[PDB]
Design brief:
Number of helices of chain B: 0
Radius of gyration of chain B: 18 Å
Number of helices of chain A: 0
Chain A: Small ribosomal subunit protein mS37
Helix content of chain B: under 10%
Largest sheet of chain A: none
Oligomer: heterodimer
CATH topology of chain B: Methylamine Dehydrogenase, Chain H
Keywords: Wnt signalling, Coatomer complex, Regenerative myogenesis, COPBeta2, Exosomes, Signal peptide.
Radius of gyration of chain A: 4 Å
CATH architecture of chain B: 7 Propeller
Helix content of chain A: under 10%
Number of domains of chain B: 1
Strand content of chain A: under 5%
Number of strands of chain B: 28
Strand content of chain B: over 45%
Entry title: Wnt binding to COPalpha and COPBeta2 directs secretion on extracellular vesicles
Order of helices and strands of chain B: EEEEEEEEEEEEEEEEEEEEEEEEEEEE
Distance between the termini of chain B: 9 Å
Assembly: dimeric
Largest interface: A-B, 4 and 7 residues
Structural class of chain B: mainly beta
Structural class of chain A: little secondary structure
CATH class of chain B: Mainly Beta
PDB class: transport protein
CATH superfamily of chain B: YVTN repeat-like/Quinoprotein amine dehydrogenase
Distance between the termini of chain A: 11 Å
Number of strands of chain A: 0
């Protein structure tokens, strides 16, 4: 999971 | 104060991650999560231009009105430049090996900074065919936000999820100083107070706080606690005595930049607030913010 994806 | 808020233009779209005002045309540049960028005439309500740039998010987007360009930074690692009169792409280069969070444009010099998840800020010179002139290394997580001191753009501040602000000098590899913000969820945004009467910087964090910083004393002037989820941005308006903050709580708040008391809470109705622009000349004190469900352009009374 990418941190700060949105 | 009397703020006399007017809804100039509202547009529904994909999630807006970047937003910027043209300084002499009634245009706003929006940079969308779908990989689309849009130029809107917010006075006429007519779309001037839209370009599918990639399929990944394009988080950062500025004008370079002096070159009639737009510059955009995407999760595909690339900075792309387009002439907005023709649509011609000017350059398209891999700027970082990771996501590009923010772009700032030097006011007088042909210099662009990019902030990225690769933990660095990179300086590009478009009068040297977009050559990498410097890599600012030292930050320990994602550089979320890059901002030139508008009083001295020989210096810029970088907002980072390592929970520090670093202030650098162009041509110097080590920071002038590091602000340990105590915003333990990281720093999403950093801006400068643009007028000469205070040496102030502002930060926003996932920790629901906004913090006022004196770059002379390196201390926290004030903490502004008025959001119920992630604070995406906090900026000083360039004419009115206000701060505008925006949150994933879907609200824009206007604070008194002297007393730090709330003037107005704006429930704009487009869900999560991601980005902010202020009109560079302060034409109609115009502000705009990018949201999950589009953007809104607002005019503020004197």
């Amino acid at each position: 999971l990418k941190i700060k994806k949105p | 104060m009397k703020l006399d808020i007017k809804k100039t233009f509202s547009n529904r779209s994909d999630r807006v991650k970047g937003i910027d005002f043209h300084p002499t045309e009634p245009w706003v540049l929006t940079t969308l999560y779908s990989g689309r960028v849009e130029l809107w005439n917010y006075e006429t309500q007519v779309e001037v231009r839209s370009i599918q740039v990639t399929e990944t998010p394009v988080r950062a987007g500025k004008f370079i009105a002096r070159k009639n360009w737009i510059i955009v930074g995407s999760d595909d690692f690339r900075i792309r430049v387009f002439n907005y009169n023709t649509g011609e792409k000017v350059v398209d280069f891999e700027a970082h090996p990771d996501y590009i969070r923010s772009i700032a444009v030097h006011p007088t010099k042909p210099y662009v900074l990019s902030g990225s998840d690769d933990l660095t800020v990179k300086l590009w010179n478009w009068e040297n065919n977009w050559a990498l002139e410097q890599t600012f290394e030292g930050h320990e997580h994602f550089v979320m936000c890059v901002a030139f001191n508008p009083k001295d753009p020989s210096t810029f501040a970088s907002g980072c999820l390592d929970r520090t602000v670093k202030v650098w000098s162009l041509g110097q590899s080590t920071p002038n100083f590091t602000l340990t913000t105590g915003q333990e969820r990281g720093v999403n945004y950093v801006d400068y107070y643009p007028l000469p009467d205070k040496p102030y910087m502002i930060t926003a964090s996932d920790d629901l706080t906004i913090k006022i910083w004196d770059y002379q004393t390196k201390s926290c002037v004030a903490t502004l606690e008025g959001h119920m989820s992630n604070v995406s941005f906090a900026v000083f308006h360039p004419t009115l005595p206000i701060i505008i903050s925006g949150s994933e709580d879907g609200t824009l708040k206007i604070w008194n930049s002297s007393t730090y008391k709330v003037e107005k809470t704006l429930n704009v109705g487009l869900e999560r607030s991601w980005c902010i622009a202020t009109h560079p000349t302060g034409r109609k004190n115009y502000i705009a913010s990018g949201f999950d469900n589009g953007f809104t352009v607002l005019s503020l009374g004197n």
